[PDB]
Every structure is written in C-alpha cells, then in structure tokens.
Design a protein around this ligand. Sequence first.
Ligand SMILES: Cc1cc2nc3c(=O)[nH]c(=O)nc-3n(C[C@H](O)[C@H](O)[C@H](O)COP(=O)(O)OP(=O)(O)OC[C@H]3O[C@@H](n4cnc5c(N)ncnc54)[C@H](O)[C@@H]3O)c2cc1C
Ligand SMILES: Cc1cc2nc3c(=O)[nH]c(=O)nc-3n(C[C@H](O)[C@H](O)[C@H](O)COP(=O)(O)OP(=O)(O)OC[C@H]3O[C@@H](n4cnc5c(N)ncnc54)[C@H](O)[C@@H]3O)c2cc1C
Lengths: 336, 336
Amino acid sequence: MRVVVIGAGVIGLSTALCIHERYHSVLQPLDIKVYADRFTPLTTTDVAAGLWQPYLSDPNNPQEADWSQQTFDYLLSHVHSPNAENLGLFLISGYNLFHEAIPDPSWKDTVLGFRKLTPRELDMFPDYGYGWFHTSLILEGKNYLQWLTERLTERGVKFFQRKVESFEEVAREGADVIVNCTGVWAGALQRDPLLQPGRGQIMKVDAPWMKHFILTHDLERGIYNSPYIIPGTQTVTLGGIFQLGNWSELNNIQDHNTIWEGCCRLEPTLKNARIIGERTGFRPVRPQIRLEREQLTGPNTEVIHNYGHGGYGLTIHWGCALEAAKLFGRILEEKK
Amino acid sequence: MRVVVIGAGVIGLSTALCIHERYHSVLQPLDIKVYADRFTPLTTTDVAAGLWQPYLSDPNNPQEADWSQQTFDYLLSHVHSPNAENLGLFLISGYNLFHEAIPDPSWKDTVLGFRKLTPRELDMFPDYGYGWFHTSLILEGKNYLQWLTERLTERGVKFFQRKVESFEEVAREGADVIVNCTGVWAGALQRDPLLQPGRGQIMKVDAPWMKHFILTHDLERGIYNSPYIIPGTQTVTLGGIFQLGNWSELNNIQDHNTIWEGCCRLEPTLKNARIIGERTGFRPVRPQIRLEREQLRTGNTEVIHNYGHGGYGLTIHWGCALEAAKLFGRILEEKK
Ligand SMILES: Cc1cc2nc3c(=O)[nH]c(=O)nc-3n(C[C@H](O)[C@H](O)[C@H](O)COP(=O)(O)OP(=O)(O)OC[C@H]3O[C@@H](n4cnc5c(N)ncnc54)[C@H](O)[C@@H]3O)c2cc1C
Ligand SMILES: Cc1cc2nc3c(=O)[nH]c(=O)nc-3n(C[C@H](O)[C@H](O)[C@H](O)COP(=O)(O)OP(=O)(O)OC[C@H]3O[C@@H](n4cnc5c(N)ncnc54)[C@H](O)[C@@H]3O)c2cc1C
C-alpha cells in the first residue's frame, strides 16, 4: 500500500499521522510519503494564532461541529501533559464582544465555563454592549507542525518538497491512495468554484501583560473583519482582516493600520507594545469542508479530499484527520 | 507642616502620595520626606506577585473589606490606560482549588465574573474536587513602587535611606506628623506583640504559556501553605510557604522543594520551565491592620500608624492610603 499525502499544513500532517497510527499494524507495507510545496514555517497554518473557536453560526454540515468537539477533547486531554509545550498548546480564557445581542454559539458547551458577560465587564469595553466569556485553548501552528513532523519522521513517513501538477502524475508514480490536503490551492489540482481565499493579515506584538484573548465582531462586516487580540506563548497576535478573492501574499499598509488602530482602541495598553512581525495568509474558504472520497485515470486511483477549513483549520483538524482515516479504512475493505 | 513617612514599601509610598495629592494645595508649606531602611527592590512588596485577593475568612475589622474593594475599583479604573504598563497592572483570571465544597468568599462580588468550577474544569485537576473561577488584577510591586517613586519625586517628596531608631529621634529633628509604615519591622519602634512575621518564599520561572493563576487550598495547613502559580508580566511566580514567627531572610532548599514539587504536580508542564530566581519575604501578620492615630509624647508629636497588612498589602494598600489621608486631615482640623 503506497499512500501519498499532498500538503504539509496542519491538515495534511495530522491526516498522515492519524492514518499511520490506525493502520500501520494491519497493512504490512504501509508506505506514506508527504509531497508539499511549502513546509513550516511557510504555510497558512504557521500564520494562525491557533485559537480554538469555530464560526459563530452553525455549520452547513452538522458533522463539523462534532469534528471541532473531537479536536477540543483531544487537545484538552493533553494540555497538562509534559509535552504540551512542544505542541505549543495551552489554556486561555477571554472575551467575545458584540454591539447587539446574539444567539449563543453551537459550541457553547464544547468550551469550558461558557457564560454571558456581566455588566461590570462590558464597562471595560466602551464600544460594545454584549458578549461572552469562556475558556478555550491555543495550539500554535508552528510548534504543532514541527511536533507532527518529528512524530511522522520517527514513524517512517518521508517528506518531499515538490509542487504537484496533477493527480494523475502522482498516480503514475504508483500511488494507491492520494490524500489531498492542499488547502486554498486545491483548485489547481481540480477546479472547485466553491473554494476561495479569505486573505488575512496579522501583527505579532510583544505585550506579555495580556493574559486574555479579545475578539470583537461587527455583524455587518463579516467574521474576523473586526479587531482581535490573541495572546500566544511568546507574542501577542493582533488581527481583524478577512478579504474574499484577495490572492496578494503581501502585507498591506492599510490593513496594518486597520489592525493597529482597531486593537489599540480596543485595548489602549497596546500603543506602546513593540511590533515583532507581520504576516499574510489565505484561509481556504468554502461553504463546507470537502472531506470525502473520489475515484478518478488510465487502467483507477482512490483520492481522499480534505480541504476548505476556512478560518478554523486548527480548531477542527483532529476530527477531520480521524474522519479521513475512516475513509481510508473503507478503501481498504473495498480492496479486500 | 513637616511630615516624615517611615517606610518605602507599598504602604508608605502610596500613603505619602495619597497625602500629598489631597493636601498640598491647602497646606502652603507641605514638606513630605520619606525615610526608609530599604527601597526597591529590597522590600517585601517587591517579593509579592501582586495578585488582588483577600484572605477567604471575613476580616476581623469589617472596614478592611471596604479598603480592599476601594483598591480594586481604583486599580480596575486604570487597567485599560497606557499608564497601566508603568504601574505593572493587568487583568488575569484563574482558579482557586479546594478538596471539598466550602462557603463563598465575602469579596466574591468585588472581582469580575465570579462563579464555581464546572465538573470538566475540576477534572483538569485530579487532586482537588471543588473551586472557583473569577477575573481579578495583578499589581506587580516592583513596577508599582518605581512608579510611586516617580510620582513622588515629581512632587518634591525627598527620600532618604536610613534606619529610624525611635519615633522621638524623628520628632527631635522637627517632624510634626510621623506616618509609621514600617510593616513587619514596626515592633522595633513601638512594641506590638500582635505583629509577627509570616515568612514566605517564592520561585520565579519562565513559563509564558501560563495565562491563569491557580491557588490551591488545604484548610488544615493554613492559607498559602499549599501550591500557588501566578503568571506575571515577565515570569511566573511559584509559591506556597507561610511560616509564622520565622525571621530567616534566606532561601531554604526544603521550601524550594515543597514549592517546586507542589507546583509541578499541580501543573506538570512546569517541569521544563527554567528557574529564574528565588526570594524570601515576611508578611506583616497581625489579626487586623493597625491603621489609626496616636499622640506620642516628645519634649508632643502626632503619629499615624499604618502596618500589619499580612499577605494582602497590595490588595488593600489604596483604601488604607485614603484612610491614612483622612486621619491626616483630622490632625489638620484639630490644629485649626
Ligand atoms: C490570519 C489567519 C489567522 C487564522 N487564525 C486561526 C485561528 O486562530 N484558529 C484556527 O483554527 N484557524 C485559524 N486560521 C485558519 C487556519 O490557518 C487554516 O484553516 C489552516 O491553516 C488550513 O490548513 P491546511 O493544511 O488545509 O492548509 P495550509 O497550511 O496552507 O497548508 C497547505 C499545504 O498544501 C501545500 N500544497 C498546496 N498545493 C500543493 C501542490 N499543488 N503540490 C504540493 N503541495 C501543495 C502547501 O504548500 C502547504 O504545504 C487562520 C488563518 C489565517 C489566514
Ligand atoms: C511571599 C509573599 C507573597 C506575597 N504576595 C502577595 C500578593 O500576591 N498579593 C498581595 O496583596 N500581597 C502579597 N504579599 C503581601 C505584601 O507583600 C505585604 O503585605 C506588603 O508588601 C507589606 O507592605 P509594607 O509597605 O507594609 O512593608 P514592606 O514593603 O517591607 O515595606 C516596609 C518598609 O519599611 C521600612 N522600614 C521598616 N522599619 C524601618 C525603620 N525602622 N527605619 C527606616 N525604614 C524602616 C523597610 O525598610 C521598608 O522600606 C505577599 C507577601 C509575601 C511574603
């Protein structure tokens, strides 16, 4: 059995690992390769703060809510483990702020200690009149990707830096299953008008007195088009940019200004915080995650798609990897 | 009017500043001088992490509940101003862990968003079965004392490094009011058998992924004789040593091991944190704060005592300071 995973973001690397844990014992030659054009630290995954939080509104596929909840339990189960530091994993609480009242999120019982904000809390934020407080987790993609890499290396998974041109090129080399975890670029392998860049930009800032995340929302502007402030391990992520169809992988001054002045107003102690770096990335936006089998091609090759995780790839990755690992088990039964 | 404030910890500096702000305009000569044996960073104020939290049991003097609330409201009014970083002041949420259910604390409505831990939060901590979550404040003594020093230097308040041997040595120099802010050492200037040292010890470690405080409680061993973990702006404080009557200003290896092993069992990710430093100080333990006036005979002289804040001098300093300034006004009234 020869398996080629395309993509070394969190989606491909976690899928690779999951497929290996569940089937190395029962497939005598289980040879897994990863083809990726970019590795950490140059993926979309490395740009994310890594806060666990799905979108506010229920997903078009209800099984995504389970995949997120399965990811949360796995990560929470390891947050006190000694190797949590190597994962870039830790607990964090904070605020979601709104101008108007709004229905409670579908994941209110996935997170810890969910509640509405008391009136004295909403006084610290003049421009906002309603919101939530809850405890979640941060999984910083860069530590995590490096962790996944070294786990798959000790399991025999080999890594190759190449741009794949077609599915059929990979099948020609003799792949049996192709796992397609190509993120926002999946359209180049197979046209998909439902997949779109959601361009984001973030600032990384030294502000270690900040112990809480703070996400604000403007419901007439789209999600993550309002300031947010997410403390990481070494640095504080400042953000609030979400632009559909924008493929420019290049930091933009206007967006820099939007992030800075938006966050500084939200939390004035930021004014003196030092800017450590700035980064742009492309959420793979789709109305739903594509996570499903497809049979292509010459004499036929199995493909497992797993892309389109928008702005919640880190939040939902483990449930997705588990599901793709299931789809892989079904391929093996069909192949006898 | 010549005022001599003895002591440059949090109590003496805040009281000096509080008195100058309220009376420099209506006292044409208001010469305030601070005398201190030790300044930052050699005071026990410097050793404290600075978490705002009273003892759990109701204070012997009910006016201390108000002094603590006034301090929290004051600090909370300044946490979102760019001044805040200079003070060393920021918001922080976290846990108080108990083995068994116990009564709520009196101060439960002073802090933000108080509530009980849910079962899934309690599961993160095997050794404890009950507790609280809430949002409080940290005021790190080191930055706060240097900020107080700067506000005071800007106001003509001159400082002198000297050991005061007696009250009337200071009166013989010409002091009209003496503000006694000598903390744990007050018994040397006037015997007070109710004032005793509560020796504590703490480690500072590098663990910047800890975003919550965690205080544990063992009602059999007494308050703060159980692991606590308090993230600061730059390092995390590990502690849990409260030894009545011990005057040894020296780090002890047994107490090191108790702190380290207790906090590592509480939070295993701490086992790879680098130890940055280690400090010992003396909580000025008294069954209630001595904040009151006394006429002492000389030649006589006016005295305001303000000492014996135990393990909550930062929690309560500002209410005490305002009270000491009222008492200063009553002195001005009697002399017309
Ligand atoms: C600014 C910003 C902030 C975010 N914050 C969060 C957050 O806080 N929490 C959260 O959960 N999510 C967040 N996200 C979303 C998250 O980053 C993404 O959903 C996630 O990284 C997508 O994972 P992925 O592996 O599919 O794609 P990415 O990591 O891009 O990985 C794609 C991989 O596919 C490879 N590839 C593509 N095409 C080919 C090819 N033809 N041949 C070979 N290799 C190919 C790429 O080189 C790369 O290796 C954020 C995103 C952005 C942009
Ligand atoms: C380990 C530990 C942790 C703590 N953590 C916290 C916490 O998290 N939150 C909290 O609220 N509280 C905490 N505390 C308690 C807090 O540190 C004390 O209550 C507070 O700092 C005492 O303030 P002070 O100004 O009275 O005395 P200290 O700062 O000592 O100041 C005393 C001053 O008086 C001077 N002085 C004394 N005698 C003379 C003299 N004869 N002549 C000249 N100068 C003299 C001393 O040199 C010094 O200048 C902690 C205490 C300890 C020990």
